[PDB]
Amino acid sequence: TGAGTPSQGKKNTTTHTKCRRCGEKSYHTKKKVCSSCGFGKSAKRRDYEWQSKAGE
Amino acid sequence: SGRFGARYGRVSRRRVAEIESEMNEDHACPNCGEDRVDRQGTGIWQCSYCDYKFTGGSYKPETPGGKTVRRS
Amino acid sequence: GRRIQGQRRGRGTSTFRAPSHRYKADLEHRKVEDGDVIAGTVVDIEHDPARSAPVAAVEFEDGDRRLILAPEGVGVGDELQVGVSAEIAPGNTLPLAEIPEGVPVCNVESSPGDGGKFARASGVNAQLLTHDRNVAVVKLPSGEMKRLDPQCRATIGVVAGGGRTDKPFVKAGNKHHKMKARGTKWPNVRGVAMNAVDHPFGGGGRQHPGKPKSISRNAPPGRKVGDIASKRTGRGG
RNA sequence: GUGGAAGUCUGUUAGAGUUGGUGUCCUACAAUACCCUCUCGUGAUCUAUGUGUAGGGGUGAAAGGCCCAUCGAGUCCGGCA
RNA sequence: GUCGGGUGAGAACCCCGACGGCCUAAUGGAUAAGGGUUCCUCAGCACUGCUGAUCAGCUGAGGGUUAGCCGGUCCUAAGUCAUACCGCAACUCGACUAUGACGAAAUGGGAAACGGGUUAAUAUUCCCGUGCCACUAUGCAGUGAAAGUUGACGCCCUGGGGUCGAUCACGCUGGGCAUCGCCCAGUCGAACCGUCCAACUCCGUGGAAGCCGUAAUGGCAGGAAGCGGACGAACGGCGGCAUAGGGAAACGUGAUUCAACCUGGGGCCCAUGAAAAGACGAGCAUAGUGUCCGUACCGAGAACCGACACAGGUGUCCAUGGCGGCGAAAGCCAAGGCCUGUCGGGAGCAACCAACGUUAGGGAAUUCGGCAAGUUAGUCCCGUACCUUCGGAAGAAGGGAUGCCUGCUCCGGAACGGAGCAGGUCGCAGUGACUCGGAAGCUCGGACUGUCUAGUAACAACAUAGGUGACCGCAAAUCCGCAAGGACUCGUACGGUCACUGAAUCCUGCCCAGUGCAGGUAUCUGAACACCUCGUACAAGAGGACGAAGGACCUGUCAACGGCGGGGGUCUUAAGGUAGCGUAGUACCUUGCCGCAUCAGUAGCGGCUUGCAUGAAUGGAUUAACCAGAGCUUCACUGUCCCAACGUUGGGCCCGGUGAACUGUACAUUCCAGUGCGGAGUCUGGAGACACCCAGGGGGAAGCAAAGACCCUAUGGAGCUUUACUGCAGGCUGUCGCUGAGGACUCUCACUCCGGGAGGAGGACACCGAUAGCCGGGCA
RNA sequence: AGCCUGCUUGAUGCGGGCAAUUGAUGACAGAAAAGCUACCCUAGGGAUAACAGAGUCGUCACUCGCAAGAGCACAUAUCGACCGAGUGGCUUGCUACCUCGAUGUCGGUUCCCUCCAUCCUGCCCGUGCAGAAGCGGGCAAGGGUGAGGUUGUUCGCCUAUUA
RNA sequence: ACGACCGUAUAGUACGAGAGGAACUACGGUUGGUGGCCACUGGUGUACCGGUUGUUCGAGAGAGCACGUGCCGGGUAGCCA
Numbered sequence A: 001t002g003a004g005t006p007s008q009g010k011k012n013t014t015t016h017t018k019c020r021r022c023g024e025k026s027y028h029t030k031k032k033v034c035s036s037c038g039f040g041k042s043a044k045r046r047d048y049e050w051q052s053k054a055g056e
Numbered sequence B: 001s002g003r004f005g006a007r008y009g010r011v012s013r014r015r016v017a018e019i020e021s022e023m024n025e026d027h028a029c030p031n032c033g034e035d036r037v038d039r040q041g042t043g044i045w046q047c048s049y050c051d052y053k054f055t056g057g058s059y060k061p062e063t064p065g066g067k068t069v070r071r072s
Numbered sequence C: 001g002r003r004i005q006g007q008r009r010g011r012g013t014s015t016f017r018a019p020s021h022r023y024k025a026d027l028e029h030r031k032v033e034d035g036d037v038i039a040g041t042v043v044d045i046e047h048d049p050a051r052s053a054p055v056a057a058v059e060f061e062d063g064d065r066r067l068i069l070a071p072e073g074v075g076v077g078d079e080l081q082v083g084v085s086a087e088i089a090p091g092n093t094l095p096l097a098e099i100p101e102g103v104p105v106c107n108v109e110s111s112p113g114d115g116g117k118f119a120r121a122s123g124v125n126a127q128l129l130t131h132d133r134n135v136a137v138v139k140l141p142s143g144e145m146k147r148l149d150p151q152c153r154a155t156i157g158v159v160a161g162g163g164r165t166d167k168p169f170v171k172a173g174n175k176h177h178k179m180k181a182r183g184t185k186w187p188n189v190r191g192v193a194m195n196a197v198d199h200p201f202g203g204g205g206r207q208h209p210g211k212p213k214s215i216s217r218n219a220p221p222g223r224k225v226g227d228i229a230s231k232r233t234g235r236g237g
Numbered sequence D: 001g002u003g004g005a006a007g008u009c010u011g012u013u014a015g016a017g018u019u020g021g022u023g024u025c026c027u028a029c030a031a032u033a034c035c036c037u038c039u040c041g042u043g044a045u046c047u048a049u050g051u052g053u054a055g056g057g058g059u060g061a062a063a064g065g066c067c068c069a070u071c072g073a074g075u076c077c078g079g080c081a
Numbered sequence E: 001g002u003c004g005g006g007u008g009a010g011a012a013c014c015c016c017g018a019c020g021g022c023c024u025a026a027u028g029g030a031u032a033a034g035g036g037u038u039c040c041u042c043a044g045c046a047c048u049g050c051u052g053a054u055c056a057g058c059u060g061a062g063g064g065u066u067a068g069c070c071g072g073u074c075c076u077a078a079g080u081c082a083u084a085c086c087g088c089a090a091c092u093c094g095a096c097u098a099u100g101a102c103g104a105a106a107u108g109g110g111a112a113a114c115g116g117g118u119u120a121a122u123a124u125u126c127c128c129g130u131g132c133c134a135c136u137a138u139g140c141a142g143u144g145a146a147a148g149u150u151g152a153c154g155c156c157c158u159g160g161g162g163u164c165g166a167u168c169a170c171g172c173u174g175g176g177c178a179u180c181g182c183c184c185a186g187u188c189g190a191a192c193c194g195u196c197c198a199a200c201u202c203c204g205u206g207g208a209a210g211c212c213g214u215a216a217u218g219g220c221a222g223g224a225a226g227c228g229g230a231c232g233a234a235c236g237g238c239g240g241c242a243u244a245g246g247g248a249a250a251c252g253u254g255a256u257u258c259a260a261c262c263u264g265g266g267g268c269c270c271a272u273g274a275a276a277a278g279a280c281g282a283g284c285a286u287a288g289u290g291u292c293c294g295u296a297c298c299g300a301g302a303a304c305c306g307a308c309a310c311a312g313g314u315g316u317c318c319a320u321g322g323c324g325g326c327g328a329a330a331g332c333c334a335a336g337g338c339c340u341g342u343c344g345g346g347a348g349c350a351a352c353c354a355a356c357g358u359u360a361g362g363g364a365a366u367u368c369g370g371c372a373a374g375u376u377a378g379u380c381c382c383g384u385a386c387c388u389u390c391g392g393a394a395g396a397a398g399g400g401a402u403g404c405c406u407g408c409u410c411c412g413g414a415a416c417g418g419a420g421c422a423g424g425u426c427g428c429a430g431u432g433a434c435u436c437g438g439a440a441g442c443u444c445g446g447a448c449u450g451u452c453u454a455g456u457a458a459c460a461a462c463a464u465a466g467g468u469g470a471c472c473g474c475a476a477a478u479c480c481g482c483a484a485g486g487a488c489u490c491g492u493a494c495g496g497u498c499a500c501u502g503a504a505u506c507c508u509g510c511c512c513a514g515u516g517c518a519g520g521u522a523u524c525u526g527a528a529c530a531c532c533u534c535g536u537a538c539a540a541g542a543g544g545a546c547g548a549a550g551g552a553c554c555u556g557u558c559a560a561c562g563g564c565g566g567g568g569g570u571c572u573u574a575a576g577g578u579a580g581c582g583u584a585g586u587a588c589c590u591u592g593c594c595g596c597a598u599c600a601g602u603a604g605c606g607g608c609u610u611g612c613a614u615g616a617a618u619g620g621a622u623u624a625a626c627c628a629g630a631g632c633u634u635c636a637c638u639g640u641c642c643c644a645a646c647g648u649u650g651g652g653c654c655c656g657g658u659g660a661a662c663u664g665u666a667c668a669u670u671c672c673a674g675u676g677c678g679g680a681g682u683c684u685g686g687a688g689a690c691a692c693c694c695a696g697g698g699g700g701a702a703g704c705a706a707a708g709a710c711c712c713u714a715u716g717g718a719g720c721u722u723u724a725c726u727g728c729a730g731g732c733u734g735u736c737g738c739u740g741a742g743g744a745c746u747c748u749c750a751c752u753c754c755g756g757g758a759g760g761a762g763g764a765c766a767c768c769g770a771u772a773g774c775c776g777g778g779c780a
Numbered sequence F: 001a002g003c004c005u006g007c008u009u010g011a012u013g014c015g016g017g018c019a020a021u022u023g024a025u026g027a028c029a030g031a032a033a034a035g036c037u038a039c040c041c042u043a044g045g046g047a048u049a050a051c052a053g054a055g056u057c058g059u060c061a062c063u064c065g066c067a068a069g070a071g072c073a074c075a076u077a078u079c080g081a082c083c084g085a086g087u088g089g090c091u092u093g094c095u096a097c098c099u100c101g102a103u104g105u106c107g108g109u110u111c112c113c114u115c116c117a118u119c120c121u122g123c124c125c126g127u128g129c130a131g132a133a134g135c136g137g138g139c140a141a142g143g144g145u146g147a148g149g150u151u152g153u154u155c156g157c158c159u160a161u162u163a
Numbered sequence G: 001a002c003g004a005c006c007g008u009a010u011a012g013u014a015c016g017a018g019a020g021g022a023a024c025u026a027c028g029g030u031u032g033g034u035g036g037c038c039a040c041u042g043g044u045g046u047a048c049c050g051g052u053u054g055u056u057c058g059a060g061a062g063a064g065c066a067c068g069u070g071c072c073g074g075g076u077a078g079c080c081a
């Protein structure tokens, strides 16, 4: 079975959903962790310096 | 070992035969003396006559070493 | 390279773990205040998923219902005893001191009260040889002369299920089912059959180990494979 | 005669797979498809959902296979002009 | 699809009828995920729709999803998280141990609902009728009440009970057909309340020494059959429910085979087939409460994922509709659905292409190769070789039969079940279509089933049972983590870890020199701390003494890495190739030589064999069975071929509509020669050449597609190896700290382990922190 | 061998320096340094190889000159060494001129044109030409040159047909 | 747009001891190639006519479906070798 089109048919699982804290559709309902703001993982807000150019 | 057809070879199924042959013989119950003991699973035997359920070998109700304990 | 299989094991992932949630009981000698008065009745015989051997259910006088490492010859109804003054019959537990020399013993403790460590597998048995006020010499199933505290409890008789090893598996499917009841990854791919990146014996136009197989005791994990610190090899001499 | 064992046999039962045609297609119906043939089909079987293992790490009946069209070291952004 | 008709400005494709078709495990019915309004109505056609459109999953505007008894909700599963504790420089990081919570919507467990009616769209939710459950209140009863039972369970075979469905018989109601007398539909009616009870188990009676019983196993003086009794089943029977409901009407009765559902018997395990909440146990009347969330629609060749209205992918139940037949097979047909696997019109409709039918004679001559196609075929009877692990080989092979009609026999309770007989009779053909093996032999490989390169490799590769070696007594061996800690392990040598070989059978020789591992070791070598000497008012530093692991040295070990030659009638370097097998999937010479077979055989098989360069678990030899594995031969068969022809369907060609992409320095009607960076439509010389268009097969444009992947170059990259360079983990070992009392020794008080505790074992060791020497492609 | 100098200062220790000799880098105008990749990746090169083209022509094919020699005698019916002179561009080698932002392999097949150094057919000459069948040579490219067994083979070996 | 071969008569002759064994010329045929044609033979012929299996239309009659003929037998025109 091909990894392409034929294997896309089996995709009906829900994972990432609207997040209670930030509003983004990034709350992984299986992990109960938001990949965008860190809700479920951190009291602090997910943030990284690499999300921008080093001198900005 | 006839269920094994022409597969596996002599020894493997020759032993399965002797082993299962001695395994299914009617065994003399330790409780009463009737030859009515049948295996219920691995190392588990039971008498259909008096219902005495007991432990023994995996394929025989008594093993050489088992019979030794009695002596000493 | 990549971590060899022996190193994946250690991480304790599902594939290498034992089906514990499926295991029955931790067959340990009961704890008796003292006196030995403790006795019970064998209520049933069962299959132990973890040892492929039968195990006996016992109802003790004081109400306790516990599974027991059953020796050969124990049947429903029989009465078992645990204590310093327990009779000397198969299926009974007492310290190596109270046991007469020359008697087959099983489920021997390593240190008084641990609950039993030695001789617990199918049809095996320890042999109580010498006594003393300080040391109890027991011959273990491996043939080794072990020196134990005479206070170490044990059960009289050999373990049930003897001869299990006598019958061949005949087919891969039979191994398969047993393995699925143990903490073991099976089947096994030979080291020499893998790529050089996956094992010290991997690689080569044809299959053969790269170096000699006898590895040193000091080799690090990932390299300690083949014949570990072999004192010798082969059958010759 | 009874019995009905088997990683047993036949089988497009369901279901799983894919030997050959080096057929059709090859700005495709399709970034792995179509048809016929062919193999497996009570078992180391097939399958749904849930769950676990995470990047020099997993997972691997071992093909350097697989880890979201990506693998002799994933992906994203940063180092970086 | 076609003919009529309807609507409309407009109709091949929007709707009605008729006629003709398509789908039957699906193209029908109900749903899970996922989508999210796609659902219903009205009004529309700029957008979307493979053409058109009055249509629509499109546009605009409105409307639609109603629950004590269907899910959620509650329980716990693998497992997840939070808090506490501990670690970490630290944390949003990390393992254990506690507590708590979380974790199952078809498809785990679970208190209780059925029938009908109704809407454009909901419906076990609304309405009508009837029923049920839980909690609480009141009242009567009750002192019982928690032991136990249930929830609650694997795989294979099978008996019995039994409903729906289907079928058979006869009656009634309605329809169809119109030479007969046939053919189709219906003949209804729930939950619930009550009642009945086979099997299993047990009791009394009884008294079998051979009887009782089964599909089979089996049962009994430790008490069989028989008899009587206790307990005891269905989603089943029976009565109510029901002068409820439903039907135009009749509004049946029996039977067989019996899905569901109930209940038993047998067999298997080196495999043992959840848990918890809850229920029962534990009465009845009346009343009150039963909130919260989900509920439309699609569920796919247009509502999901794949950029699409995508020939792909995508779970569950309907597995009992009729004929057929072994059948959930084919083929045909109902119920139900559809003509939307959605562009049409025209040409006897050419060439050419895709699928396909038929081909005389020859019959594999074709080709690397029988690739492709074909041949055979279902069932019964007869019959069946070598070889073999005695299972198999085997459906070996080979031979014969096969329909219909009339009247019968046998088995069985019977079937609308099966096995046969006699007579009659039709065809070229009776498994008449459909369904449906071609067969045989030799050789190689792997024992077998099984695994694999999702997307060019299915194999001889991986696995496997079997064989073997290695480590370890559990405070272990092996492995993960920086640590706190952890896997193995609810495990304990009949264990499990680390490796090799790869079923069975006959076997498995010689070598320990090198390398590896391990043991030993007088002597030699061997670091740091402390110590001693010199040096320095101290220190740097130089030297000495002592000496751990390790090494030198000795030994053990090849089913440990590996080796088993040249020369002569020993030498390198330990031994010098044994049983076997051999021109090998290993043999360069090579198409080796001889033979078989063919008209002819670099093939194949048998023999020989000096083997360029076979050989014993780097396993050797051999081998029944198995195989989409490699090679060879035979019989049969055939358009593979001789050598091609005719035909069928869809395209192609013409017409309406829709309508891209690839590619393009420029010029360009070329051809022959030559020349040129030596491979020119364009330069030179000649020749030829009126322009444009249609169809064609592809000679050229060193055609188009991809900054060649081959080769080389770069003080390029990466993966991999090792006795390359340099380092880093880890293991061993000494030393210092923890650390105490009296080159060998005792003790107990720290510290460690075992124990519920008392206490026991060990003990200044071990663990841990620091450092030193050795090993160290495990890693950079 | 002598001298200069070391952080407030003196002494001592132990350092730092001026001049020069000796110790090695042999890849010798001096890095401390092993391999595999067909799992491969990038930059580029026709600056450099493999196909093919092109040049060459030793090799290869064919020819000619001379003609020793033998051919029972007789060089020249026929065979024909040595040595010498050439033609071709089918083999092979050499070169690196063309192409690495791509000129797809061998063999086969199918279909078309051509060359002659002619295998057959037509016409001839000689003969060690009686005839018949041959052997050798000349003109000549109109037509023909087929089917099969092993092997992927080209080649070649083999079979039966054939002008 | 024709190439080539075999055979008969010549002739058992010329030649030659014999064995063996021609030619000119005239004829008949075969093969390869070429162009055309279908009375003859052969193929096709899903025009057509018949037989017959399963199933559906109640039987009969007459039909549909079974891949573009269910299968089998015969086959006109045309096209062909």
Ligand SMILES: CC(=O)NC[C@H]1CN(c2ccc(N3CCOCC3)c(F)c2)C(=O)O1
Binding pocket: F050, F051, F102, F103, F104, F105
């Ligand atoms: C496709 C491609 O690379 N195209 C570019 C060039 C190179 N080439 C070529 C070179 C060697 C070989 N081979 C032939 C066989 O021996 C090995 C080299 C070749 F076939 C073909 C060619 O024609 O054009």
Ligand SMILES: [Cl-]
Binding pocket: C178
């Ligand atoms: Cl095992």
Ligand SMILES: [Cl-]
Binding pocket: E071
């Ligand atoms: Cl629901």
Ligand SMILES: [Cl-]
Binding pocket: E159, E265
């Ligand atoms: Cl029964």
Ligand SMILES: [K+]
Binding pocket: F099, F100, F102
């Ligand atoms: K090139």
Ligand SMILES: [Mg+2]
Binding pocket: C025, C026, C027, C028, E490
């Ligand atoms: Mg235990």
Ligand SMILES: [Mg+2]
Binding pocket: C015, C017, C179, C180, C181, C182, C183, C184
């Ligand atoms: Mg497991």
Ligand SMILES: [Mg+2]
Binding pocket: C188, C189, C190
């Ligand atoms: Mg293995």
Ligand SMILES: [Mg+2]
Binding pocket: C193, C194, C195
């Ligand atoms: Mg490999």
Ligand SMILES: [Mg+2]
Binding pocket: C001, C196, C197, C198, C199, C200
């Ligand atoms: Mg490695």
Ligand SMILES: [Mg+2]
Binding pocket: C207
């Ligand atoms: Mg091997």
Ligand SMILES: [Mg+2]
Binding pocket: C207, C208, E618
């Ligand atoms: Mg090997």
Ligand SMILES: [Mg+2]
Binding pocket: none
């Ligand atoms: Mg899963």
Ligand SMILES: [Mg+2]
Binding pocket: none
């Ligand atoms: Mg490889």
Ligand SMILES: [Mg+2]
Binding pocket: none
């Ligand atoms: Mg409308």
Ligand SMILES: [Mg+2]
Binding pocket: none
């Ligand atoms: Mg509805």
